Amino acid sequence: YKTKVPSPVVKCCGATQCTSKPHPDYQCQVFTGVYPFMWGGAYCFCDTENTQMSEAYVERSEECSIDHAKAYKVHTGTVQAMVNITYGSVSWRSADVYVNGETPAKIGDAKLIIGPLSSAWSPFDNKVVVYGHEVYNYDFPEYGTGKAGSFGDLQSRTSTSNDLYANTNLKLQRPQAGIVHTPFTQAPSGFERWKRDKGA
Amino acid sequence: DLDTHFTQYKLARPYIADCPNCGHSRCDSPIAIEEVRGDAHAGVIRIQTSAMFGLKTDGVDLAYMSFMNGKTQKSIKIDNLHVRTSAPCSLVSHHGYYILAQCPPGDTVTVGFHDGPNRHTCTVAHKVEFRPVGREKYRHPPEHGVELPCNRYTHKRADQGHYVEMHQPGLVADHSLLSIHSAKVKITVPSGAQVKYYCKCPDVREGITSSDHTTTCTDVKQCRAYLIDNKKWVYNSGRLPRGEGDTFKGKLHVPFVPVKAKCIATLAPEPLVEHKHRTLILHLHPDHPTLLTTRSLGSDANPTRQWIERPTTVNFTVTGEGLEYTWGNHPPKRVWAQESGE
Amino acid sequence: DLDTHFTQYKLARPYIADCPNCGHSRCDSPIAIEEVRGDAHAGVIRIQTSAMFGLKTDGVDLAYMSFMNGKTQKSIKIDNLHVRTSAPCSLVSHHGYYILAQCPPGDTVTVGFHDGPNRHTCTVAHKVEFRPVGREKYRHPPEHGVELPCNRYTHKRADQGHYVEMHQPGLVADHSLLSIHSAKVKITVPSGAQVKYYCKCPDVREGITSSDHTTTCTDVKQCRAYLIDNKKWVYNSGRLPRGEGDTFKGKLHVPFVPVKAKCIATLAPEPLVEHKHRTLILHLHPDHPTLLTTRSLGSDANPTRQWIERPTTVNFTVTGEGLEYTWGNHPPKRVWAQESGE
Amino acid sequence: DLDTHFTQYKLARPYIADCPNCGHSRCDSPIAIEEVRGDAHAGVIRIQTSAMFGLKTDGVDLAYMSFMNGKTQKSIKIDNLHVRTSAPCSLVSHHGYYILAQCPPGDTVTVGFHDGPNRHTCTVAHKVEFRPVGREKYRHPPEHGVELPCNRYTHKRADQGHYVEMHQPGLVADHSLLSIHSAKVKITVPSGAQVKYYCKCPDVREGITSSDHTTTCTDVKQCRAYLIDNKKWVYNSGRLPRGEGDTFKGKLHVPFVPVKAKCIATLAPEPLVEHKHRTLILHLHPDHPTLLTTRSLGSDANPTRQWIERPTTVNFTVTGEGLEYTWGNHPPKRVWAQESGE
């Protein structure tokens, strides 16, 4: 994730009710009882009616585009090969072929039909996570569900997808002792772990 | 072409926020550190100060230095920047509010320049590490070794891969304004800026004015010293008070995108291969903790994983068809162990 | 009111003692560090230099700087103080011989100002830590969390809660005195101070004088260059030679009393409560090592304790009557687990 | 007598090599660090910069500073040297290419001065530790304790105990030479130095000349900008290109020999001896990890070893004839345990 906090509201004398904006995991909680020191000491002249509305939503990191795990539901598909035959006196063909037992590949001069192979062990499991080059046959929980801290706390369909699922357990707390800031209490990602408490 | 991101430069100002342990304690530093990102691999962190260094107020020289002093900027030279952590970091580049710097690991992050009269630093908590990409768990990038696809931030500015919202500032306090008109509390204005004013007593209730007086109240400590000065937008820090009026425009890029650089990267010393009957003894002796692992290529995989930092003679029951062997990010080996028992 | 502790100021001088690893090795620094106290919680250490910074020699400005150079003081500006440890500390306040400074943990303590021509520092061993008060074992105070009763030293000086004995100095060496009277070794005096003198040979045997000569001996290296200069008392450092005459007066306060401040303090992230049949599964995920513990409220207590820093799903066989649960210094929870097995 | 090692001074130059993580990345710093030696005990490391600080180019003042800027030296003041590691080190002394500095432990080593316009540092990986000699495993030398035979480097220069080969430099690149003669690429010379020249095209093929032109090629990027400038030898760094001609002379000493200094050294707090029947209970409480060990003086030795850092009440079945006891480098004790069971 990146808790890209929108800048909180500070009403000086009285309440500012928050609304549940549609941002992913839009955590927002009104707070009173502040006295926000901002560059001149405090600035709101009340002392309890000083209101502070903190809001924070979850958003894809900039690394999400590039450094990102990637789940998959994996079926069986169809296997391939760049079969060389330095045939007979032909002495050469290096052709890409299939396995399904009626496909020819007339590259060179020979027509060749391969498979289907009997050894249907797809080393990929049904559910797979993928990361850069290291591929993990992991039972990823699902889109839309991943427990915060666990893998897939952020779950975006793709990189472009503005919608997502962010169970991060993002819980705002009130800022301390009349100062402007935004306590965001949050699990570091299940993408942070899964990079150093992962599987092989 | 340092003149291609006047999106930020002209239109954004050096924001000032509340640093958490600003030398003594919580000050309000212009270089207040938000969004520490020790998430790459190359010894690098991308940081945002609330201060917008780069060009000056107007038009010149990335390598100058504009923070906020007063309500005002101070667009001057960068002379003695210091990012640091457990050790002093190395700057990489600055653009906008944002700096990239090569740091070691550190429990915290600790930033600061030197204006010249004062140290005037800012410091923050953030868990930092630098694993290099590879099965070697170094603490630091070497001079040599294989290159392989790390995650890392750029040197450059000509960058659009993302953009963060940067709309207006809210007001700010400035009780330097609220002087006294020899019996009454006297507000003034920066340059005709919009000062939002009233006191606990009943007097002028909005304040959109030049320098006003205050008929009713007298004490400076019961009045609204405010600066609606939204001629330049800001970063939308959590340590910003909202500009209550509107979501003004000011969508503004990020320079330091995470990119797929191939870091100059790790390599673990070669193994000592030793033969036995369908068995690899391997006296082994790394530089750093190295994740070794294998794959007995039977349909029985029987793999193994163990980080090795302490030199260790290990063993591997190799089968008839083969095994493979991965001494860190050194490439994977392979081995025929047919018979040797005659 | 910086003018309420002329007990120390007028009457105490900046003492000079033997620093143990004074940059190179054992020098005699005026800022020789004794009584390091990393015994509070708030990132703070109270230190005593043998140097008495604060007001000047006479009457003004706590923020000036009087150490001993020569037999003499040098009551000038504090410009570039540096306390430090594993990292550079943060000064909190100075009063008298004594400084309070916010430090991180460190195996040692390492102090030093900059006179301007020279670094002139002093360093020492002392085991330092900062546990915050709470069942969270942080390494550093956060910005937020609950407040609770820590132990900590004050900012202030108007302080009498304790006082340490501060009687006279003993003599000190000063062989700058023992010049040569063109064949004889020649002692002088600071200002009419009391110079205690004789040589290995037989000549003047006490020395309570103005500038004397030496009839008998010749070599500077066999004579008593002493300064009984007890116009200003000192701290009773272990690195002081006794003033053999008497226990003179000079009972003198300590500024930095340990007080019952409520530190801005720790807080561990909330737990994930999960139900089972008379059993709390708790997937748990802290920031720092957190001492969790419980009390099965039967007359069978059956408590549990474990510091948790690694995130861990735990379990608790809750009974019929109840259990309580203490996620760090977060307040204690309580739970009805009657049946759930239908 | 700073004038006894003109072996190096007159005849060696400040070499420049390729620093590995020179702030940003691999630069070519004159202070390029080779041969880090964290092999002594006294908190000290002997380092070689490729830069030869010490006297100037000609004859004066060890405490000045000559590195290479350009093809040229810059023999000026040392003002703001910084060796550092995990923490900032303390300089001990420099002589020639070589500096001794008191450092703490550190995963790396990180060196750098300040010319004045620029930081201009150099950094390197090297595993550093400082065990003091003794059965106490401190992290740092104390002020007190017993003295015992450590290994350590000298302060001094009047040193011949070893000498390293220091023959010539090879050539170096300098494309500042290869200017343009308004259509042709134009080489020049430093002072009549020997410039080794040709381009990918066919033109002058050796180059032992004053300022030549280039008839054939035009592009600066396809020519041999070389400086055979072997008027002053160098250190034989691995980051040197060979001077292909010959093994010239220039055998040159090392200042900082490892010597058998008795470090001011460790000492562990005394034990609490407690009697039992042929048994030593010992409540024990060290400062640091202390290797305790014993020798039951029977021909049955039955010794024991255990590093103790955590305070521990231990036990020792003492026999009739005796046992001995070694609380760290505190001297060995001995004990009669005859009967006590009456």
Spell out the SS3 assignment of C262-320: EEECCCCCCCEEEEECCEEEEEECCCCCEEEEECCCCCCCCCEEEEECCCEEEEEECCC
Distances (CA, A) of A111 to A89, A92, A96, C51: 16, 13, 12, 96
Question: Which residue has 């590093």 as its token pair?
Answer: D307
Cis peptide before A116 (omega within 30 of 0): yes
Q: In chain B, which residues have their Cβ closer than 8 Å to the Cβ of D123? A: 90
Of D12, D1, D24, which is closest to residue D49 (Cα–Cα)? D12
Distance CA D17, CA D31 (A): 8
Q: In chain A, which residues have their Cβ closer than 8 Å to the Cβ of B161? A: 62, 65
CA D316, D320, D326, D327 torsion: positive or negative? positive
* 3-state DSSP assignment of residue C7: helix
In this structure, the dihedral spanned by the alpha carbons of residues A12, A18, A24 and A27, taken in order and rounded to 10 degrees, is 70
Residues 117-156 of B with CB under 8 A from A: 127, 131, 149, 151
Which secondary structure element, helix H or strand E, spans residue B8, and what is its range? Answer: helix B6-9
Strands B304-308 and B272-276: unpaired
Distances (CA, A) of C260 to C98, C154, C257: 20, 9, 10
Q: A11, A39, A196: which to substitute to probe chain B, counting the most B Cβ within 10 Å?
A: A39
Q: How was this structure determined?
A: cryo-EM
Of B189, B192, B195, B191, which is closest to residue B172 (Cα–Cα)? B195
Contact C124 D139 (CB under 8 A): no
Distance CA B223, CA B200 (A): 6
Contacts of residue D225, defined as CB under 8 A and 6 or more positions apart, other chains included, come to D173, D174, D175, D176, D177, D178, D187, D195, D197
Distance CA D197, CA D176 (A): 14
D75 DSSP β-pair partners: D66
Q: Shortest CB distance from A187 goes to which of C144, C145, C285?
A: C285
- Are B199 and B224 spatial neighbours (Cβ–Cβ below 8 Å)? yes
Contact B24 C87 (CB under 8 A): no
Q: Is the pair B, D in contact (3+ CB pairs within 8 Å)?
A: yes
Residues 142-171 of C with CB under 8 A from B: 142-143
- Separation of CA B287 from chain center: 30
Nearest CA in chain D to C108: D140
Which secondary structure element, helix H or strand E, spans residue B84, and what is its range? Answer: strand B82-84
- Separation of CA C134 from chain center: 23
* 3-state DSSP assignment of residue B70: coil
Please compute, for residue C227, the number of CA atoms within 13 A of its CA located in the half-sphere on the CB side.
Answer: 19
Q: Shortest CB distance from D24 goes to which of B102, B140, B143?
A: B102
The resolution, in angstroms to one decimal, equals 5.2
- Are C86 and C104 spatial neighbours (Cβ–Cβ below 8 Å)? yes
Distance CA A187, CA A151 (A): 11
The answer, for B241 touching chain A at a CB cutoff of 8 Å, is yes
Q: Count, in order, helices (H) and strands (E) of chain D.
A: 1, 24
Amino acid at B29: S
